[PDB]
Amino acid sequence: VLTGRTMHCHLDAPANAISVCRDAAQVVVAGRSIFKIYAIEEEQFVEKLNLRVGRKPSLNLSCADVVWHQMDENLLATAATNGVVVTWNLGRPSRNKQDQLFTEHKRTVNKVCFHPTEAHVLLSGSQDGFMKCFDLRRKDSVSTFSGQSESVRDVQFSIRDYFTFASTFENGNVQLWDIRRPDRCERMFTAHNGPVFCCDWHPEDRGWLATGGRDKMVKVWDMTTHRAKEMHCVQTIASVARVKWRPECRHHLATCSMMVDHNIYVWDVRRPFVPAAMFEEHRDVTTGIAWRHPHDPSFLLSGSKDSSLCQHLFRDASQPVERANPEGLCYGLFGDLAFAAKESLVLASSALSVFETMRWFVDTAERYALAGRPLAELCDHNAKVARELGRNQVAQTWTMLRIIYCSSRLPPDFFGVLVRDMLHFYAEQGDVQMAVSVLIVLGERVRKDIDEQTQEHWYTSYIDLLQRFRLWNVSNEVVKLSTSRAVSCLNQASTTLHVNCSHCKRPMSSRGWVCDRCHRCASMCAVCHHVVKGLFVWCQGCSHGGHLQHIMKWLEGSSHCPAGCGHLCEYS
Amino acid sequence: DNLAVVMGLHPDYFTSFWRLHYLLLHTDGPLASSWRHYIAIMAAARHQCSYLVGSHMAEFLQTGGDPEWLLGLHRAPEKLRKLSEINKLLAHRPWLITKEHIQALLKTGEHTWSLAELIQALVLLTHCHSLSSFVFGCGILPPSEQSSPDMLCFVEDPTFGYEDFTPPTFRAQDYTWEDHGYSLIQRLYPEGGQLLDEKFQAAYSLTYNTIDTSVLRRAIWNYIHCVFGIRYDDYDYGEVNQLLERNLKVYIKTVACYPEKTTRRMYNLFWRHFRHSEKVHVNLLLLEARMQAALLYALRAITRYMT
Amino acid sequence: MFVARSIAADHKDLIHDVSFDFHGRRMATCSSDQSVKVWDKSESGDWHCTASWKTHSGSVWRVTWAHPEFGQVLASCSFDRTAAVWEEIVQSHWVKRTTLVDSRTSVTDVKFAPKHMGLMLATCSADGIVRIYEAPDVMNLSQWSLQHEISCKLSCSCISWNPSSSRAHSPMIAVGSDDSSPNAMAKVQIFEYNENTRKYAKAETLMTVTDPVHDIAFAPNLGRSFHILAIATKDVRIFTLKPVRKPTKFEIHIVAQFDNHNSQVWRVSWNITGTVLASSGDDGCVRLWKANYMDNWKCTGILK
Ligand SMILES: [Zn+2]
């Protein structure tokens, strides 16, 4: 089998390519300024050979893709951003593994692959849309089938059908070729919108290809039929690079990002909106991921740009599913409780219900009286209303206030210090309705006994409560005659409409109904044809209107503007 | 305006440019319209082009701006004053840009910016710079003297211009507008990314006919990206020479850096009996190539700070 | 005895938050499949879905309403490291306005400030940064500015403002941690706004709480002189933050400790007036609590 735990290895330069050997013991981390081969031990990992030993500060040997070949133990090939491809043979006798070089490419090469059985085949992807294949015969190094598309970004050969291969392009169309017939393609479908950066065949099934692209998508296509189809679509938070299937588990994908995200995720494909594991140790974008052996899923090797090679293990993950909050609660103005929780406590869906678990507030607000009567009559009316509603402890307070105020004798200020505490008692339980009501009823007698800030607090809290229930009438009746000056000025700001004539254009000044210049009766009704001296209604489109009641009646049975106009100032 | 007629030489580019302009200057976003016009004026005042500054002063005044801000720059909000040195760097020497400026920009305080406004500010600055370059390189009379069918200062350190060759250079294949730069903008600026991308593809669609097309435009692209310093990885610069000529190189390496000096005679001899449309196409491709490198430098500066 | 009437959300994944707006007649549900749904009340008496779209590219954790004065506005935080603001435009047209992209790791909570000091918004972050936004022009919802930022040196998982509307309580915020650190560092903190230095400052720390915190909620004031806070770590807890007469100094007290759940308590809420408190644990039941004029809290209902 295999053994080992999580590891690190701090490198010298950023790296963007990794490959593993058939022995499941070597890593071939490469990049722009480093090309090493590593041996991993159970405790640490030690460099075994530095392939840049014949060092030359030249661009001849960069790296953007390394592919290890499993037919022998020495055949290796690298892709350079100079457009040249350098293959290596570890069996060479001097300190230089270079075997054969190739310069049959226009601009650059991006991905290099082998073919599992035959050892004399080597594909290559370009930036010029010129994919090529090579051989071991030095003279024979050309098979230059091209797709009239943009830059190639990944080529892969199938597992079972060892005559065909796949390829992905920049515009977003995935193709399928066959080595025996390199003239015409076998399929082409538009996988993404934007480049597709990676692909990976399914180890188990006969034909199952997964492509990831810049559009933050991962799609798995079924190419068994004549026309392909999309089954699953995993949505990631950044552009997807280097997607790879896990071994022995046919429904898991390991995908890394190409920007922003530093983490590595494994998805369940069946459940696409939440991952299964979250490896978070890298402190920059990871660049390569490879499963160590294709027959033992426990270990994943993943180097990054932070100059680090890691071998994290499945068991020591950072799962987000078990660290979630499954439920949610909320109240309502009517005592309705909304409760949602997943159907494992009442596992990929949740059920919610509204529990129909302050009626007196509305009737108390409506039926109370706050002015227009003497003090005794107001207290009596409020007491009667409170008694009829069912609360007697509230009802007797009104009558006691009436007895106190609406009667040598007892000292005049006897109950001042005493009435002053009933306000606080009623306020410190959430019943601001009473406190505000009795404050309004009494006024100047008790005004200079409660701090101004407390008065503002009670007024504002009660006003907000009243407005929540859409009781605008009471909400304005509180503002109009509130004791505090700063509170009784809220409908006094930006509540004056500036109005001018639509004939002479000048602003109607003063308080009248006749234009200064036009000399006409501007405020003329459309239905009454009389003069409007009170409430005038207006239409934003028709620019018409008149008396409130007449326009109401007309719009109840008609649907056109009363002034002829023709514009239906209520769209159906 | 007059510039529209000259720019409308081809229809595959004018639509993209108009779309980007409408998104940048009129569509609602993280910054008020008056602020956008003010930073546009500040950006355009770096090459001392008066056509854009004149066209933008009226727009700033008509959109509820404060006349008091146009009596100089010291009478502007301190939040907008923190952008002066970044504008200075982006104008003519973008190689020397780094994390210190951006961290000072997003440093906590009272005039502290936010990362959803800085990106729009940078895009606007680069757009205005390259537009000024086009205006002074295809001279427009406030209608072009080039072909045929007051100002105050508003500047910090006006005696700073474009320096010599470049120093650690830039290997453009390690940072491309394709793989990752577009990804960063698509996340910071969701709508201003595809419009830039459409504009770039449009600038790459136009090809000349005077005598294999693509190689001619490649020479221009690589030459300007080198004079700014973006050194590529698949080019032999011995092939750059026998694609252009000195009669068509002083023009280009004068407009890209200091377009304030380009007179009638500076153009009078471009080359041959040109069709006068290929020359407009060449003066246009410079717009994209010059606004690309600065944006790449700024995006690299952004990405180093969030990593 | 409430009647549990169930509605079919048809969400393709879990549900993480439900919120009533200002009037008790519309609710908004956020799910883990990048969707936000809105349900309105009929005169018949049932909820029907009236709007649904794709919000983020991650997993939406919370959705909150704003005051009706500023319009019909919604906010949402997601695992894609952003935060958004939406408005309904008259049929059901919900349009995106801004994308607060300043975060680096994730956003866990999002809450609107009480609508007496502007249109202000506070977002948490798993890295431990609480940021406060603002919109000086109340009517452009595309122009948001960053005013303050607080670093709490611990993972952040909840947030809750102070609804007290009096001119005697400087605005303050409460943040809750979720770090399973071996050390018993305090996991609930309080910050308050100082009028003269224009800066948020640490006010008090709840040292007695050394267990992971999943929800934080203040109680509506409506005329009280002190403050009440509810924390759901592993048993429901209620605190008191009475101040001292003239940052400011509070004398914290413990008033309730209810292990009735025999599980981990996830979320809590307050009724409308700071009289009843709700709870939600792993047992799958909601529970209500109330006081008895001796400040002796006791259960007042069990709902399945
Ligand atoms: Zn009308």
UniProtKB/Swiss-Prot annotation, chain A:
WD repeats lie at residues 58-98, 104-144, 147-187, 191-231, 235-277, 281-324. The modification Phosphoserine is found at residue 141. InterPro entries: WD40/YVTN_repeat-like_dom_sf (IPR015943), WD40_repeat_CS (IPR019775), WD40_repeat_dom_sf (IPR036322), WD40_rpt (IPR001680), WDR24 (IPR037590). Zn(2+) 3 binds at residues 539, 542, 567, 569. Its EC number is 2.3.2.27. Component of the GATOR2 subcomplex, composed of MIOS, SEC13, SEH1L, WDR24 and WDR59. The GATOR2 complex interacts with CASTOR1 and CASTOR2; the interaction is negatively regulated by arginine. The GATOR2 complex interacts with SESN1, SESN2 and SESN3; the interaction is negatively regulated by amino acids. SESN1, SESN2 and SESN3 convey leucine availability via direct interaction with SEH1L and WDR24. The keyword Phosphoprotein applies. It comes from Homo sapiens. Its main location: membrane. It catalyses: S-ubiquitinyl-[E2 ubiquitin-conjugating enzyme]-L-cysteine + [acceptor protein]-L-lysine = [E2 ubiquitin-conjugating enzyme]-L-cysteine + N(6)-ubiquitinyl-[acceptor protein]-L-lysine. Catalytic component of the GATOR2 complex, a multiprotein complex that acts as an activator of the amino acid-sensing branch of the mTORC1 signaling pathway. The GATOR2 complex indirectly activates mTORC1 through the inhibition of the GATOR1 subcomplex. GATOR2 probably acts as an E3 ubiquitin-protein ligase toward GATOR1. In the presence of abundant amino acids, the GATOR2 complex mediates ubiquitination of the NPRL2 core component of the GATOR1 complex, leading to GATOR1 inactivation. In the absence of amino acids, GATOR2 is inhibited, activating the GATOR1 complex. One of its GO terms (molecular function) is zinc ion binding. Zn(2+) 4 binds at residues 544, 561, 565. It is an enzyme of class 2 (transferase). It comes from the Eukaryota. A zinc finger (RING-type) spans 523-572. It is found in: Lysosome membrane. A zinc finger (C4-type) spans 500-522. One of its GO terms (cellular component) is cytosol. The keyword RNA-binding does not apply. Pathway: Protein modification; protein ubiquitination. This is GATOR2 complex protein WDR24. The gene is WDR24. Zn(2+) 1 binds at residues 501, 504, 515, 518. Belongs to the WD repeat WDR24 family.
Swiss-Prot record, chain B:
Changing residue 52 to C: No effect on the ability to inhibit the TORC1 signaling pathway. L-leucine binds at residues 207-210, 213, 278. Keywords: Acetylation, Cytoplasm, Isopeptide bond, Oxidoreductase, Phosphoprotein, Ubl conjugation. It comes from the Eukaryota. Residues 150-307 are annotated as: C-terminal domain. Functions as an intracellular leucine sensor that negatively regulates the mTORC1 signaling pathway through the GATOR complex. In absence of leucine, binds the GATOR subcomplex GATOR2 and prevents mTORC1 signaling. Binding of leucine to SESN2 disrupts its interaction with GATOR2 thereby activating the TORC1 signaling pathway. This stress-inducible metabolic regulator also plays a role in protection against oxidative and genotoxic stresses. May negatively regulate protein translation in response to endoplasmic reticulum stress, via mTORC1. Belongs to the sestrin family. Interacts with the GATOR2 complex which is composed of MIOS, SEC13, SEH1L, WDR24 and WDR59; the interaction is negatively regulated by leucine. Conveys leucine availability via direct interaction with SEH1L and WDR24 components of the GATOR2 complex. Interacts with RRAGA, RRAGB, RRAGC and RRAGD; may function as a guanine nucleotide dissociation inhibitor for RRAGs and regulate them. May interact with the TORC2 complex. Interacts with KEAP1, RBX1, SQSTM and ULK1; to regulate the degradation of KEAP1. This is Sestrin-2. The gene is SESN2. The chain holds residues 77 to 480 of 480 of the full protein.
From Swiss-Prot, chain C:
One of its GO terms (molecular function) is structural molecule activity. There is a cross-link at residue 12 (Glycyl lysine isopeptide (Lys-Gly) (interchain with G-Cter in SUMO2)). It comes from the Eukaryota. PROSITE patterns: WD_REPEATS_2, WD_REPEATS_REGION. WD repeats lie at residues 10-49, 55-90, 102-143, 151-201, 208-246, 260-299. One of its GO terms (cellular component) is nuclear pore outer ring. The keyword Hydrolase does not apply. One of its GO terms (biological process) is defense response to Gram-positive bacterium. Its main location: nucleus. Gene3D superfamilies: YVTN repeat-like/Quinoprotein amine dehydrogenase. Keywords: Cell cycle, Cell division, Centromere, Chromosome, Chromosome partition, Isopeptide bond, Kinetochore, Lysosome, Membrane, Mitosis, mRNA transport, Nuclear pore complex, Nucleus, Phosphoprotein, Protein transport, Repeat, Translocation, Transport, Ubl conjugation, WD repeat. Pfam families: WD40 (PF00400). The modification Phosphoserine is found at residues 170, 181. Component of the Nup107-160 subcomplex of the nuclear pore complex (NPC). The Nup107-160 subcomplex includes NUP160, NUP133, NUP107, NUP98, NUP85, NUP43, NUP37, SEH1 and SEC13. The SEH1 subunit appears to be only weakly associated with the Nup107-160 subcomplex. Component of the GATOR2 subcomplex, composed of MIOS, SEC13, SEH1L, WDR24 and WDR59. The GATOR2 complex interacts with CASTOR1 and CASTOR2; the interaction is negatively regulated by arginine. The GATOR2 complex interacts with SESN1, SESN2 and SESN3; the interaction is negatively regulated by amino acids. Belongs to the WD repeat SEC13 family. This is Nucleoporin SEH1. It comes from Homo sapiens (Human).
